[PDB]
Paper text:
pmcHuman ornithine aminotransferase (hOAT) is an enzyme that catalyzes the transfer of the δ-amino group from l-ornithine (l-Orn) to α-ketoglutarate (α-KG). As a pyridoxal-5′-phosphate (PLP)–dependent transaminase, hOAT has a “Bi−Bi, Ping–Pong” kinetic mechanism. In the first half-reaction, PLP and l-Orn are converted to pyridoxamine phosphate (PMP) and l-glutamate-γ-semialdehyde (l-GSA). l-GSA is then prone to cyclize to Δ1-pyrroline-5-carboxylate (P5C). In the second half-reaction, hOAT catalyzes the transfer of the amino group of PMP to an α-keto acid, preferentially α-KG, forming glutamate and regenerating the PLP form of the cofactor.
Author numbering: 36 to 439
Write the structure that this text describes.
Amino acid sequence: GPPTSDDIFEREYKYGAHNYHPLPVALERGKGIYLWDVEGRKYFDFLSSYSAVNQGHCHPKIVNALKSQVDKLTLTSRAFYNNVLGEYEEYITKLFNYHKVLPMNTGVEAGETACKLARKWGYTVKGIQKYKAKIVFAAGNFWGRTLSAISSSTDPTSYDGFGPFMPGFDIIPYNDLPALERALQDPNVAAFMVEPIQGEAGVVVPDPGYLMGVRELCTRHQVLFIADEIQTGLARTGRWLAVDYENVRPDIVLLGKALSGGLYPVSAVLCDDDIMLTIKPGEHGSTYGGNPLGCRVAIAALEVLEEENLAENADKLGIILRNELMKLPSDVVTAVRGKGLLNAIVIKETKDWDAWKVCLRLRDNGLLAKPTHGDIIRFAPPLVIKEDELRESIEIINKTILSF
Ligand SMILES: Cc1ncc(COP(=O)(O)O)c(CNCCCC(=O)O)c1O
């Protein structure tokens, strides 16, 4: 007989690393906004694989692209050309209006690529002496699990026990233009990297004008503005890029997640020639980066986001969702924040009542969500959700919260 949910749990515990403690639910199927476990139970997905399935689970067009390409050609490596990569590159660089794209697989690789680009540009264009180039980050940032990524982190669970740490990474508070100015007084600073909204920190939305400030502060000090839109980009927040809300053009744009609809690890780094061309042949790459299969999947995913106008959907439905969430009692839900379909609530955590328990009961009532720490619950359903479905999921969130 097929394994039960408990069987799945014990098997992963026995033969898999304990680097996660996931919400006890064992899914075997997913489609659109919905997930199904081995017992056949139906659930709303309100995490969307950290925006990777903005298009919903197993969106037919992207599945068709994957299936059509998998029979033809999947991996030539970059020692030779394949026929798809140039097509994808032209499409995506004209969609976001940058000169060039460097393809990688995972989001952390896009971040690493951005850091290498920043340092090369600093040494070779800005004249920073080797090796004194600094990159500034914002506290609460998350951009991966490599040693470099955790070296920028202020979250002890990311970095504790994994040092020594990468030099040249300065940290300043988020949503703090004066701190950024002070930091950008150092001429050896090559770049400032920042999330338009801090996802894993708990959907931290900075104040209006922060992004435009950052653009101005980077421009005035000859510092590269790196926007990590891996979670916030691709329709999730109600625009194609979150930075669009303030009409800001970063120097480097990081893409991932929804770039494939969950079908293939594809990330992208976008920038103009004066930054991209600092890296010469043989100095950077990846085995699977830019393989034809991922490129087909990515073209399809981006087409889906454009054709179904998922950005406008996310904007309208996020308005509705936050409105309904504000009606929860302030004595139990202390805050609701977000943009588009990236939202979170903060609950008045107690010794006995926390966000984990809330997510357990939400699961019990057919809605899957992720708690950050003990007091933050993310609400981020796929952008294909309908209003009638969004309501009903809201009705589950209510009832669950007011059950405690
Ligand atoms: C803004 C932002 N940029 C970059 C990244 C890095 O993306 P990778 O594909 O996990 O390396 C993230 C990582 N997201 C992680 C959640 C999934 C998990 O840890 O299991 C992010 O949030």
